[PDB]
């Protein structure tokens, strides 16, 4: 039932609209500096927030399943915190990227820190499930000796 | 269980297919006008259907994301109906972009109509969950007074 | 309840990790062929990393998406399955193509048969389930004739 997946939806749709956010970005860097589709390239202030909206793009989904795994094997308000910090570190990062390709890193690593917490969590959790079941199978297999 | 959700990953399966034909597309592309990898530039009709794929592509785990919220907190067969008129867009949108970068404008502006309404209905929906209980708590705080 | 979709959640999981190496690697050729953000173009072996992991994201979420519909309206250990197998083409391919564009073909092959028969799956699944009402409400109608 949702009563127990409605952080995790919330943070879900917080992340859509972050990316949303970006998009806007890429579309009025275009129009300001008159790069126009195709063509992903042109002055390095439009570069980088192309790069940086792209990059967010592609870690969406690892955010999204790992957030999912996280809150339902683990425990829904500490995957909704990672969460939200991990969209924070985000947006600092788009922020810094846009202005500087150097201003980039201190928040790469801030979102790498709440993603890879994320991770962890997911594989403990996993780890909880499965783990009783496969050691009682392999110490009944262990008798009679 | 599986019976309020069937439209919902019946929706889902479309875009995976949708996704795949784009693929597809860009693969016979490289074929037609010689582009071979790496190299993701060469002659412009070549880009145009790069960058048509490869747009759809950041907004598939939006749709998604947005589909199973809305989906779930407001009502299945209404975000199943925004997920089809959304595919159909991008759909045009494809088609469009390949013969002229100007023609992706009119059915971008369909897909983005369909998928803010998408976020309207998730939005919605969770406040719906959360905003009755956050009230009811902030009015036993004044009590008394 | 999560006792169902464990495995699934499990191949999600393995899934997100081969990811975060891929982009470890990405990271690293950035390094030792010194192609630095924004820019991704460079030496070839830099750019066929790049395109190795681009290309792999752009396939994450539909390997994902098809995976849990599949899992949940086919077959859970089946789809499990398929997931491993098509991730562990996904490995090979990226490996493939980081040496030799060429090499990137045989383990693409490999991993769509994976995620074809994924897709199948899928849609036998939502076949079973939409198909059975859908002809009694048509044979209801032709009574009576
Ligand atoms: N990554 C996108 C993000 C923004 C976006 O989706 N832009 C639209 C509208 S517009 O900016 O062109 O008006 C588009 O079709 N972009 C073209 C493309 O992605 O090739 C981009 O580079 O444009
Ligand atoms: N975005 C992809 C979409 C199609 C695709 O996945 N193509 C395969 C097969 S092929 O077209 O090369 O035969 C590939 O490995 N593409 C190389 C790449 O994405 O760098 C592309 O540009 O190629
Ligand atoms: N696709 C990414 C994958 C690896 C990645 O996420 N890199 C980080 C860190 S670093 O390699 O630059 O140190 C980044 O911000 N990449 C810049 C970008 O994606 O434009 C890339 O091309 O860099
Ligand atoms: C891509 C992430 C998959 C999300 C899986 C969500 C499964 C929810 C069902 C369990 C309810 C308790
Ligand atoms: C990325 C989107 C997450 C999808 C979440 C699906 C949760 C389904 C469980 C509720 C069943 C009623
Ligand atoms: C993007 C993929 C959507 C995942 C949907 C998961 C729904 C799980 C609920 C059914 C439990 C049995
Ligand atoms: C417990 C803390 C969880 C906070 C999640 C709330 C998300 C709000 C985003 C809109
Ligand atoms: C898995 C997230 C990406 C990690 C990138 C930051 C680490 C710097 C080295
Ligand atoms: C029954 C098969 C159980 C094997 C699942 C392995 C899960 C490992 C989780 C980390
Ligand atoms: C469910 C029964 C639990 C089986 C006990 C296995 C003990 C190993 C856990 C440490
Ligand atoms: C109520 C309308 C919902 C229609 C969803 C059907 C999806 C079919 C796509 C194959
Ligand atoms: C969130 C979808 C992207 C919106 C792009 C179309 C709006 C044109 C300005
Ligand atoms: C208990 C914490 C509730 C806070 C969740 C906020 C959700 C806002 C949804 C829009
Ligand atoms: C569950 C009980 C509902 C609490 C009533 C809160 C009233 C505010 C809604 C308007
Ligand atoms: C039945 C076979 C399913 C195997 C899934 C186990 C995934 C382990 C990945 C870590
Ligand atoms: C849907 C997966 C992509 C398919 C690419 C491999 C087929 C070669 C032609
Ligand atoms: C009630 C509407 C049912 C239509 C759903 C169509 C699903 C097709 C699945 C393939
Ligand atoms: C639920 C009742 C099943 C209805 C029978 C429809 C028969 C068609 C299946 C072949």
Redesign the interface.
């Known amino acids: 039932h949702?009563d127990e997946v409605?952080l995790l939806?919330?943070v879900?749709?917080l992340?859509?609209?972050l990316?949303?956010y970006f998009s806007l970005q890429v579309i009025s860097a275009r129009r300001a500096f008159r790069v126009?589709?195709?063509?992903?390239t042109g002055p390095?202030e439009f570069?980088?927030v192309?790069?940086a909206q792209?990059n967010c793009?592609?870690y969406?989904?690892?955010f999204?399943?790992?957030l999912w795994?996280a809150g339902?094997?683990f425990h829904e308000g500490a995957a909704a915190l990672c969460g939200l910090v991990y969209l924070f570190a985000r947006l600092r990062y788009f922020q810094g990227?846009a202005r500087s390709?150097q201003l980039?890193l201190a928040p790469l690593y801030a979102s790498a820190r709440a993603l890879w917490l994320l991770?962890a969590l997911?594989?403990l959790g996993?780890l909880a499930?499965?783990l009783p079941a496969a050691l009682r199978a392999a110490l009944l297999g262990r008798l009679r000796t």
């Open positions: 949702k409605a939806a919330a879900t749709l992340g859509v609209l990316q949303a126009s589709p195709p063509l992903t390095p570069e980088r192309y790069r792209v793009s592609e969406f989904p690892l999204l399943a790992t795994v339902i094997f990227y390709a980039r991770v997911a594989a996993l499930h499965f």
